[PDB]
Design a protein around this ligand. Structure first.
Ligand code: PO3
Ligand code: FE
Ligand code: FE
Lengths: 119, 111
């Protein structure tokens, strides 16, 4: 009686996002989780932002990872200031901060995961 | 801006951690894992945690990674994308059967 979820990702609407965002952990899974986790592989997102600037009422972490360090790079807009992240990197977006990201560079297997931290 | 780049953090469980409980003033999860293409290795050690752990299996394209999760004497074969809950106190481990470059299994300890 292991609990396994394979109906994934779960498309959920997120503010400012052009398309539904793909979630792999949602707050209601397994009786309730303190985080939600969405994101995906970046190799076909170079130059194409997934969202307009937006704000959450919870903290969000960007987790940028790739098989080899340096293989992925995103630009995070944080209240009108641009920050370049190079894999591997984790960036905290405080609740209420206006933000979005643009993929600068990405190999196959590069991911950006957004982790909403439930307070 | 709060950016952490000294990653992964090797911690004995050493596992490569990308989120640790003390980051950013305290986090409700920890996240460890790594790329699976170099783990496809003959053996894996059963172990237990005092918190729940979620396995998160992903690959660039669905179905490109496959693991065996051993959970309290039961074998489970999972295909990406998959999420599996390992309850605290359960003896468990996983073995990578198949993985393209850029496949990950992340272990997420839920506080
Ligand atoms: O859609 P975002 O939470 O990665
Ligand atoms: Fe966001
Ligand atoms: Fe474990």
């Amino acid at each position: 009686d292991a609990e396994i979820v394979t109906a994934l990702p779960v498309p959920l609407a997120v503010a400012g996002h052009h398309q539904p965002a793909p979630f792999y952990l949602t707050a209601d899974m397994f009786g309730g989780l303190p985080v939600q986790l969405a994101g995906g592989e970046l190799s076909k997102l170079v130059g194409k932002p997934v969202a307009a600037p937006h704000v959450h009422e919870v903290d969000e972490l960007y987790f940028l990872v790739s098989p080899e360090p340096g293989q992925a790079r995103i630009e995070v807009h944080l209240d009108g200031v641009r920050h370049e992240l190079v894999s591997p990197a984790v960036m905290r977006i405080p609740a209420g901060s206006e933000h979005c990201f643009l993929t600068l560079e990405a190999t196959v297997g590069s991911y950006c995961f957004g982790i909403l931290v439930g307070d």
